[PDB]
Amino acid sequence: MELKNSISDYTEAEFVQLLKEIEKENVAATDDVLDVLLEHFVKITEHPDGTDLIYYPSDNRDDSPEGIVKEIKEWRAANGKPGFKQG
Amino acid sequence: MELKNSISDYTEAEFVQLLKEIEKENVAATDDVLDVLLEHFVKITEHPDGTDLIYYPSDNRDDSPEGIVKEIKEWRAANGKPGFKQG
Amino acid sequence: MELKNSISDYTEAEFVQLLKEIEKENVAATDDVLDVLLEHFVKITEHPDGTDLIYYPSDNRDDSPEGIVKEIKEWRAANGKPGFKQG
Amino acid sequence: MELKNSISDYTEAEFVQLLKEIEKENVAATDDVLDVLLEHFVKITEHPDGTDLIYYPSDNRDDSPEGIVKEIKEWRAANGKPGFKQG
Numbered sequence: 001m002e003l004k005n006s007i008s009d010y011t012e013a014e015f016v017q018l019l020k021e022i023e024k025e026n027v028a029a030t031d032d033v034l035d036v037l038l039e040h041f042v043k044i045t046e047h048p049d050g051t052d053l054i055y056y057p058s059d060n061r062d063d064s065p066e067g068i069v070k071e072i073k074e075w076r077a078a079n080g081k082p083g084f085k086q087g
Numbered sequence: 088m089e090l091k092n093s094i095s096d097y098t099e100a101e102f103v104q105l106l107k108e109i110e111k112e113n114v115a116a117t118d119d120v121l122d123v124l125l126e127h128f129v130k131i132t133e134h135p136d137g138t139d140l141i142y143y144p145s146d147n148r149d150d151s152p153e154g155i156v157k158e159i160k161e162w163r164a165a166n167g168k169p170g171f172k173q174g
Numbered sequence: 175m176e177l178k179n180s181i182s183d184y185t186e187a188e189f190v191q192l193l194k195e196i197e198k199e200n201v202a203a204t205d206d207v208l209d210v211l212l213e214h215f216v217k218i219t220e221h222p223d224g225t226d227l228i229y230y231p232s233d234n235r236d237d238s239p240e241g242i243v244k245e246i247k248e249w250r251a252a253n254g255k256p257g258f259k260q261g
Numbered sequence: 262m263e264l265k266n267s268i269s270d271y272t273e274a275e276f277v278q279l280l281k282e283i284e285k286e287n288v289a290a291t292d293d294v295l296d297v298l299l300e301h302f303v304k305i306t307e308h309p310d311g312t313d314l315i316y317y318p319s320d321n322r323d324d325s326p327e328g329i330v331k332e333i334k335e336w337r338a339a340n341g342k343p344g345f346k347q348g
Contacts (some may be wrong), residue, residue, distance in 0.1 A: 080299065
């Protein structure tokens with residue numbers, strides 16, 4: 001197992017792909033994979049709003065993976081915390 | 088016959104027409120009008136790629152006035168920037 | 175922190191200010207801050223010449239912050255890239 | 262010209278000098294320069310508490326460039342990550 005524990009463990013491209021899986025499982029017949037991916041997303045982002053980031057986007061941004069990534073990046077910088085794996 | 092300050096001064100159809108006009112200017116005798124048009128495109132879109140959206144387009148997107156508009160709306164939306172006027 | 179990952183995040187004045195700091199750090203007894211600012215400069219400008227603009231000015235151009243800024247301004251404009259924020 | 266891409270490029274003494282300048286930059290009304298140094302700090306250390314290390318120090322160690330450096334050193338060694346250049 002090649003486990004990712006924090007956001008620095010990720011690159012903006014790998015995180016975008018994790019968000020695409022979530023979108024894929026959101027439309028899936030069952031929520032079994034979805035429930036686990038949501039828990040992982042909440043744990044690696046450390047953002048207080050949790051899954052609200054996915055389900056309730058602020059009016060300005062959209063709920064695309066890129067818009068969510070931009071939201072996280074901005075909030076990590078604002079709070080002086082490390083972001084993704086820079087590349 | 089209006090001076091357009093930003094993207095919110097354009098409806099999407101109007102912008103697609105502007106792109107069509109850029110195409111014709113591309114084959115005109117001089118670049119005098121083309122250059123003013125290209126500078127304006129950069130100004131209103133604010134996209135990092137600039138005129139590359141027209142000339143060295145993303146492969147995962149269709150090279151057409153509509154493929155161009157799509158990319159523009161998506162990048163702006165993802166980035167929290169205002170889009171086109173309604174029409 | 176506030177992220178400024180693009181030239182459009184700076185007005186020309188803020189950029190001249192940035193260059194003024196580089197000018198100061200360039201003659202300082204320590205180079206630590208200088209090196210961080212030089213990498214930022216190259217990354218936000220995207221100019222193929224990089225730091226040569228600061229150290230090796232063209233024959234009619236200056237290595238003053240105002241002249242380096244003018245050179246970036248024209249270069250991006252000529253190449254269909256977005257410019258400085260409003261101011 | 263080498264560019265300090267990681268903590269491996271810094272000896273402890275250089276890093277300390279870097280934090281000393283960040284601490285005066287707080288005196289600097291150019292948050293633009295300070296924000297660039299802070300982004301670099303967070304990037305090279307990859308420590309969880311990011312800028313908290315400098316601003317909201319744990320009252321467990323000393324609030325000084327040398328105290329911040331010992332902690333990073335400690336955390337990196339505890340985490341199996343590369344440390345500072347020897348010198």
